[PDB]
Design a protein around this ligand. Sequence first.
Ligand SMILES: CCn1c(-c2cc(N3CCN(C4CC4)CC3)cnc2[C@H](C)OC)c2c3cc(ccc31)-c1csc(n1)C[C@H](NC(=O)[C@H]1[C@@H]3COC[C@@H]31)C(=O)N1CCC[C@H](N1)C(=O)OCC(C)(C)C2
Ligand SMILES: Nc1nc2c(ncn2[C@@H]2O[C@H](COP(=O)(O)OP(=O)(O)NP(=O)(O)O)[C@@H](O)[C@H]2O)c(=O)[nH]1
Ligand SMILES: [Mg+2]
Lengths: 170, 165
Amino acid sequence: SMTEYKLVVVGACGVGKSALTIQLIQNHFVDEYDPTIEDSYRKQVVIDGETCLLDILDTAGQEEYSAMRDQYMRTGEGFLCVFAINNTKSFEDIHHYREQIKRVKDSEDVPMVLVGNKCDLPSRTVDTKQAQDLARSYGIPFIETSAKTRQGVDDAFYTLVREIRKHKEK
Amino acid sequence: MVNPTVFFDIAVDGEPLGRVSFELFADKVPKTAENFRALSTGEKGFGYKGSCFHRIIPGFMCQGGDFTRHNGTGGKSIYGEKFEDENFILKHTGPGILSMANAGPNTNGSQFFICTAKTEWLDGKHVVFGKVKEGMNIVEAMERFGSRNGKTSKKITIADCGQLE
Ligand SMILES: CCn1c(-c2cc(N3CCN(C4CC4)CC3)cnc2[C@H](C)OC)c2c3cc(ccc31)-c1csc(n1)C[C@H](NC(=O)[C@H]1[C@@H]3COC[C@@H]31)C(=O)N1CCC[C@H](N1)C(=O)OCC(C)(C)C2
Ligand SMILES: Nc1nc2c(ncn2[C@@H]2O[C@H](COP(=O)(O)OP(=O)(O)NP(=O)(O)O)[C@@H](O)[C@H]2O)c(=O)[nH]1
Ligand SMILES: [Mg+2]
């Protein structure tokens, strides 16, 4: 059967992990704030001419439960690390997620994409160059998104699948 | 100040399960207790009657109180959409504790949770304002229909509610 990819979406509360995931899966924008406990979704897609099954874990941004993330980090194959362009704290939180993934997986080669979300909003506080430099230092792609307008949504998840494919064949 | 007592009659897919009553600690958190009391009687013209427990996580808590959107994101207090954290005198010491849900500091509305275990990491973040008096076994029975992420497998509603004392 088609290959399944276990993707995990991580980042601070409110950055739009659920809004991005629900746009990908359900093609609508959730304007209300329903902070996540943990949700899973499945979708078949075609990426570079190859049909595959996305298994997406949408995680909580709650700072209180950082120790509870190790389990799903061991299970996940690739990680979307999401911050909001109008939330500098969420960008600073990215480093801790990346380091936690690197620690739990014991690898620098974990498939990962840095996602700067909410690019439809006017109040930018994280410079695009800041995020580009960080992604380059990690050696991972950087994608700007808006769950509200759908800009970059497919690109973010599909790029992560491409990173997993490169990793499985390296 | 005397602590009032309120009750919920809980239903599962519209069928009666049982009554849970709560002592409200008006002697420590009068404004928070009064909000829950008034929402339980419906005397302001809105409140808990007919709303559901949207999140039940066995081993932890049952959460409800969204009578405005019925989707876990809503609710409102008798003071406006949100009100301040009154104090954190009382702690999440064990099963039966009744405490305010929130989305960060000073965002109390109507959503609340009933603990089914000690949840001490919520101390100082969620305002505790009551405790189950009678019907803890009904709160336990509500855990029959919860799940790891809280999604319920049957519709758990407050069929009726009001004040006893
Ligand atoms: C990491 C997984 N995980 C856990 C958790 C944690 C643990 N531990 C931590 C503690 N360890 C001890 C120190 C050793 C043991 C292991 C074990 N297993 C789990 C669960 C079952 O694994 C899936 C939780 C938890 C809680 C959240 C997100 C993820 C969570 C979360 C999201 S939103 C919120 N929390 C606050 C929420 N806000 C709103 O709903 C806002 C909505 C909008 O505005 C009005 C309305 C709110 O007020 N409450 C009212 C209060 C209880 C609270 N919900 C809730 O549901 O807690 C669930 C739970 C299980 C108690 C905690
Ligand atoms: N303007 C705008 N708002 C967005 C965007 N993405 C999410 N939001 C809004 O930001 C809020 C939080 O979104 P949500 O997807 O719940 O964030 P989350 O990262 O899943 N939070 P949690 O970690 O608590 O589950 C919601 O009100 C949502 O509508 C976006 O791209 N643009
Ligand atoms: Mg979410």
